[PDB]
């Protein structure tokens, strides 16, 4: 696939192909360069280029593995913020789907695993490197992601209201009030807690939630 050559020619070819937008061939060249010469100067730049190419080529698992390698090999490096941002962005991009995106399906109530991972990674980025140029986009993504995780919680609470499971509803809304206090889903889920408290004849406890609802109404 790749002819044997000194590292400089291989890296030149890889850069030329990245600039032309040929992700697959650039990935092949960079992987060959990395395997053949893991000790040379190019050991870092090829890692970064591989991360970028993997992410653009939609080979997200490989991008995640490469980021994991890089974070362990050079836990202190001037461009770590870039790698942390790319980890968060990879986890975010691993969430969306195309078809039900086109048909306008609300994907909030599907698996939130990747959303939580991306939130963790972006939070690490923003708390660690507030001066980096990626902090603003990280904050916007976090503000959206917190409300993509409160919506899932509300979606579970709605079902356990339908099936008439009241303790589950109360606990779920309590968890929402403790974790995602300021989101809109917490304001929508609050009247579900009052109904649950009143279905179990604990009215003296439902009045407190009624007070909270009244004090924050539009």
């Amino acid at each position: 696939e790749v002819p044997d050559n000194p590292p400089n020619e291989i890296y030149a070819t890889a850069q030329q192909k990245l600039q032309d937008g040929n992700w697959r061939q650039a990935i092949t060249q960079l992987e060959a360069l990395d395997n053949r010469y893991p000790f040379g100067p190019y050991s870092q730049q090829v890692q970064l280029d591989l991360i970028y190419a993997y992410y653009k080529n939609a080979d997200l698992p490989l991008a995640q593995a490469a980021i994991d390698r890089f974070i362990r090999l050079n836990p202190t490096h001037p461009n770590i913020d870039y790698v942390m941002y790319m980890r968060g962005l990879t986890n975010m991009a691993l969430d969306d789907s195309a078809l039900q995106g086109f048909f306008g399906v609300d994907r909030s109530d599907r698996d939130p695993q990747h959303a939580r991972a991306a939130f963790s990674d972006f939070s690490k980025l923003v708390r660690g490197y507030p001066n980096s140029q990626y902090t603003t986009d990280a904050t916007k993504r976090l503000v959206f992601l917190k409300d993509r995780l409160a919506k899932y919680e509300y979606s579970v609470a709605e079902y356990y209201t339908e099936r008439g499971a009241w303790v589950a509803v109360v606990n779920r809304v309590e968890g929402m009030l403790r974790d995602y206090p300021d989101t809109q889903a917490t304001r929508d889920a609050l009247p579900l807690m009052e109904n649950a408290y009143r279905q179990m004849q604990m009215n003296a406890q439902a009045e407190k939630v009624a007070k909270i609802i009244a004090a924050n109404s539009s």
């Binding site: 697959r24 730049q45 280029d49 991360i51 992410y55 923003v126 140029q133 902090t135 959206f144 300021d182």
Partner: protein
């Protein structure tokens, strides 16, 4: 792979996240203590630099080879 205008740099995945509504805190009425402060899903207040959405440069930084 593809042929599009400036698809080398910009993010993949549109810009839906820029339309998310801002967050606002709940008010605790008189004579009660809300539990809200107990979470770890905190978003720090930061005035950090940066662009947003498609205006960001994802191209990897250039090591001083």
């Amino acid at each position: 792979c593809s042929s599009d205008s400036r698809y080398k740099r910009q993010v993949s995945g549109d810009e839906a996240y820029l339309e998310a509504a801002p967050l606002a805190e709940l008010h605790a009425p008189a004579g009660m203590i809300l539990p809200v402060t107990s979470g770890d899903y905190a978003i720090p207040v930061t005035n950090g630099s940066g662009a947003v959405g498609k205006a960001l440069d994802i191209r990897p930084p250039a090591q001083p080879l």
